[PDB]
Amino acid sequence: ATSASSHLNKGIKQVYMALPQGDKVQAMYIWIDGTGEGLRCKTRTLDSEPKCIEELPEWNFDGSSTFQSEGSNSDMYLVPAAMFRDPFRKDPNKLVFCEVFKYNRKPAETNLRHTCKRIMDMVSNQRPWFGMEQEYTLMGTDGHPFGWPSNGFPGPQGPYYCGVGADKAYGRDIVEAHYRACLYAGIKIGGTNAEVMPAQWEFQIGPCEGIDMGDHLWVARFILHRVCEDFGVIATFDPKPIPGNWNGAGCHTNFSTKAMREENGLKYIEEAIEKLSKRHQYHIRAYDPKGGLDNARRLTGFHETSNINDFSAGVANRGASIRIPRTVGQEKKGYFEDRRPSANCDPFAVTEALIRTCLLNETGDEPFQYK
Amino acid sequence: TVTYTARVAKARFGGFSKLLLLWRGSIYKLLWRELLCFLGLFMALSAAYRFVLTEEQKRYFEKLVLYCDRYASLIPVSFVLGFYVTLVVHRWWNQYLSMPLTDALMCVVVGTVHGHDERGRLYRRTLMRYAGLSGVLILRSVSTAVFKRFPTIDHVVEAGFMTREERKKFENLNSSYNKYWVPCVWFCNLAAQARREGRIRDNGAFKLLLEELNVFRSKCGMLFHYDWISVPLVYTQVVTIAVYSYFLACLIGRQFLDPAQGYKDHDLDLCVPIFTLLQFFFYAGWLKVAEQLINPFGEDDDDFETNFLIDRCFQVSMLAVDEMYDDLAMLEKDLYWDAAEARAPYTAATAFLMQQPSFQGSTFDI
Ligand SMILES: [Ca+2]
Ligand SMILES: [Cl-]
Ligand SMILES: [Mn+2]
Ligand SMILES: [Mn+2]
């Protein structure tokens, strides 16, 4: 069942969107709220099209309304971090992804980009590249997956993965609209597929260098939510939307450095993985917005997943925590895939943990300060 | 090129007369060698007549001087000089108008190829660099100075006009003809790609870009045409033979004869034929005008400054399409927003010349 807003005449809205807007420009400021997994937005009018992110003014909002502050000093600040073209309003309107700061200009608790950028600047010469496979499930407003029988289940899994046809793929209109919307916005979207669970989908973001991975994925998530809002359905990043023999949603992260991409870079890939072998618990905590409880429902070691309590790595191992692609093993260079991160992970937390363990050789149960 | 239009801004008492004191690109710098040669032969022949030749041979020599003076025709050579030099000047000016200039292209590109990002900037810069590269290729094909600046395509690559990959694409093409047109085809392909990608917003803008590209390319082709098709060699040889025949006639026919013979029109000997030297200046310089303008892309002082034009076009085009793209001062009211008349003031130096009744027509003074 789709939302009441989706039943409003879309024809009418278009007619208003066809009006020439004139000299004023709309900027939509996007930020992460106090849950560390929700996105918030609002719009301001600018006098002219900004040429770069530097021209965008800082803004503010009430943190007590976003689970981000309490009491008197609840005013929070928005500092623009990345700019994109607005696919919902078209050029010259912009999407402005912002960092959140408290009233005293300290980073907000869900502001993970502030530290993530400092870590990325530390290893800039090694040029870390990331890719994330964002899995998501389309849901009706009733909390049941989009397209599934009322209070019931479709046929067993098997035909839905990369499926085509009215009985195989549910809500491809949303997937096509999102893909185009991301390409128009300047998001580094690498592809899409239908997932094993019906009404479950995936888009790939990358390759992205350093802090660009978190910006591109967060804005790609925002566009998906905004596109799904137009169609009147919900995109969930819950790692296990439906209990039982229905696939979880993960965010598989591909990681490579300049050394790993160069000839005979497999030795550096293996060195990074054995470093990851010794910090499995540290990464599980970082790979989930609430410390790894959500990912416990997904990482059961059954549905092409690994076990949350046990670390494993191998070439072409779908069930392993870390997978080296078969081609990467043959070519002796390229990347490796971390399959642990949950679909509702913060990419700033995930990328920072990979750099700290693999590149800065950090150890122990707490992140190093100033290094 | 030698520019003196500042000197001749007004018709002064000594306006053109002081232009005879200039040296760079002057008649003297072009003629003094032929002048010394003509004077040397005239003086040697006069000295031989005065001293070496016998008295008996001197009568034959002076009869030959009279015979050669009778056929010294200065009027007919003026016609062939006037017509030939007018044709050469027509070709010279049309060749200047065919210089590959990218101002029209930069205006269209900055107004039609959009995007503040890296890709739009790459589009604008590469579109203007392609036109610059085709200009450099045709000019190094036609101009000696540009060829010495770009002796090889490697020099073009190091200059930044063409890249390594563009060089590989350029050399791999199988053609035995000059490839100055290749960057124009690249421009057309890049413009079509920009239109397909939405960088060019409207269909009219793409058409305007291809119209302006074909104007630029036709100018390059016209430079190639002028370089290939010389002034017909027979006509150049006709004018040279007429001038040299007249001067060979003047070398002997104007020889100073001994006044002792009492021949009419030859009863004086100034040992220097200054009026014949002035006629030499006149006719030899009139031929030298064509001799300098026949190929205006050489290294003459009055030849076109092709390297300067390449530098100016490249720098200005890059500035206009990159730093000036959508970089405008905010719209504000001018000094005459509320004024019925929009008139600027005059300085103290121009007011007393100006402030005169404005011309309305020939028929309004009845
Ligand atoms: Ca010349
Ligand atoms: Cl809004
Ligand atoms: Mn997948
Ligand atoms: Mn994968």
Q: Is A186 annotated as a binding residue?
A: no
Q: Which ligand is nearest to the CA of B292?
A: 1
Phi, psi angles (nearest 5°) of residue B160: 90, -5
| Buried/exposed B258-282: b ≥16 CB within 10 Å, e otherwise | eeeeeeeebeeeeeebeebbebbbe
A196 Cα–ligand 3 center, Å: 8
Report the alpha-carbon distance of residue A83 to residue A56 in Å, rounded.
9
Q: Please give the backbone phi and psi of residue A300, each rounded to the nearest 5 degrees, phi first.
A: -105, -10
Beta strands A251-256; A189-194: pairing state: unpaired
- Resolution in angstroms comes to 2.0
State whether A52 and B116 contact (CB < 8 Å): yes
User: How crowded is residue B315: how many other Cβ atoms within 10 Å of its Cβ?
Assistant: 11
Helix (H, G, I), strand (E, B) or coil at A111: coil
- CA A153, A158, A162, A168 dihedral sign is negative
Angle (nearest 5°) at CA A246 between A241 and A247: 80
Ligand closest to Cα of A343 equals: 3
Nearest-by-CA chain B residue for A91: B115
Both tokens assigned to B150:
């770009």
From residue B266, alpha-carbon distances to A236, B74, B256 in Å are 117, 19, 7
B115 Cα to the center of ligand 1, angstroms: 44
Q: Exposed, middle or buried, A149 (CB in 10 Å: 0-12/13-18/19+)?
A: exposed
> Which residue type, as a one-letter code, is found at position A339?
R
Computed on alpha carbons and rounded to an integer, the radius of gyration of chain B in Å comes to 30
Q: What backbone phi and psi angles, to 5 degrees, belong to A322?
A: -125, 135
B300 labelled binding-site residue: yes
Interior angle at CA A242, CA A236 and CA A247, nearest 5? 90
| Residue A22, number of CB atoms within 10 A of its CB | 6
Instruction: Report chain B residues whose CB lies below 8 A from the CB of A22.
Output: none
Structural contact between residues A354 and A287, judged by C-beta atoms closer than 8 angstroms:
no
Q: Can you give the residue ranges of every domain in chain A? A: 1-109, 110-371
> What would the two tokens of residue B247 be?
């001067």
Residue B231 token pair: 């002034």
State the SS3 of chain B.
CCCCCCCCCCCCCCCCCHHHHCCCCCHHHHHHHHHHHHHHHHHHHHHHHHHHCCHHHHHHHHHHHHHHHHCCCCHHHHHHHHHHHHHHHHHHHHHHHCCCCCHHHHHHHHHHECCCCHHHHHHHHHHHHHHHHHHHHHHHHHCHHHHHHCCCHHHHHHCCCCCHHHHHHHHHCCCCCCCCCHHHHHHHHHHHHHHHHCCECCHHHHHHHHHHHHHHHHHHHHHHHHHHCCCCHHHHHHHHHHHHHHHHHHHHHCCCCCHHHCCCCCCCCCCCCHHHHHHHHHHHHHHHHHHHHCCCCCCCCCCCCHHHHHHHHHHHHHHHHHHCCCCCCCCCCCCCCCCCCCCCCCCHHHHCCCCCCCCCCCCCCC
Instruction: Report whether A324 contacts A314 (CB < 8 A).
Output: yes
Say if residues B163 and B157 touch (Cβ distance below 8 Å).
Answer: yes
Place of tokens 């080296």: A324
Q: Ligand 2 center to residue A26 CA distance, Å?
A: 9
B7-32 b/e with 16+ CB inside 10 Å = b? eeeeeeeeeeeeeeeeeebbbebbbe
Cα distance from N-terminal residue to C-terminal residue, chain B: 49
End-to-end C-alpha distance for chain A, whole angstroms: 50
Q: Is B117 in the A-facing interface, judged by CB distances under 8 Å? A: yes
Angstrom distance (rounded) from CA A178 to CA A173: 9
Q: Give the H or E element holding residue A40.
A: strand A39-46
| Cβ of residue B116 closer than 8 Å to a chain A Cβ | yes
3-state secondary structure of A327: helix
Residues on chain A touching B330 (C-beta within 8 angstroms): 48
Dihedral sign from CA coordinates of B234, B235, B236, B241: positive
- Cα–Cα distance measured from residue B128 to residue B123, given in angstroms and rounded to the nearest whole number: 9
Residues paired with residue A251 on neighbouring β-strands, in sequence order: A134
Tell which A residues from 149 to 208 touch B, by Cβ distance under 8 Å.
186
For testing the chain B interface, which of A24, A91, A209 should be mutated: the one with the most B CBs within 10 Å?
A: A91
- Cβ atoms of B140 and B150 closer than 8 Å: yes
Query: What H or E segment, with its residue span, contains residue A100?
Result: strand A94-101
Q: Residue A303, by phi and psi: left (phi above 0), alpha (psi -120 to 50) or beta?
A: beta
User: In the structure encoding, which two tokens stand for residue A279, read together?
Assistant: 């910090």
B69 CA distance to ligand 4 middle (Å): 103
CA A241, CA B89: separation in Å to the nearest integer?
85
Residue of A nearest to B201 (CA): A91
How far apart (Å, rounded) are the C-alpha atoms in residues B354 and B126? 48
* Chain A residue numbers touching B326 (CB-CB < 8 A): 49, 51
Cα–Cα distances in angstroms (integers) from residue B239 to residues A197, B84, B235, B242, in the given order: 93, 7, 6, 5
DSSP designation for A6 = G
Query: Which long-range CB contacts under 8 A does B195-202 form with residues at least 24 apart?
Result: B199/B113, B199/B114, B199/B115, B199/B119, B199/B120, B199/B123, B200/B112, B200/B113, B200/B114, B201/B112, B201/B114
What is d(CA A166, CA A147) in angstroms, rounded to the nearest whole number? 10
Distance CA B237, CA B319 (A): 48
Cα–Cα distance between B73 and B248 in angstroms, integer?
11
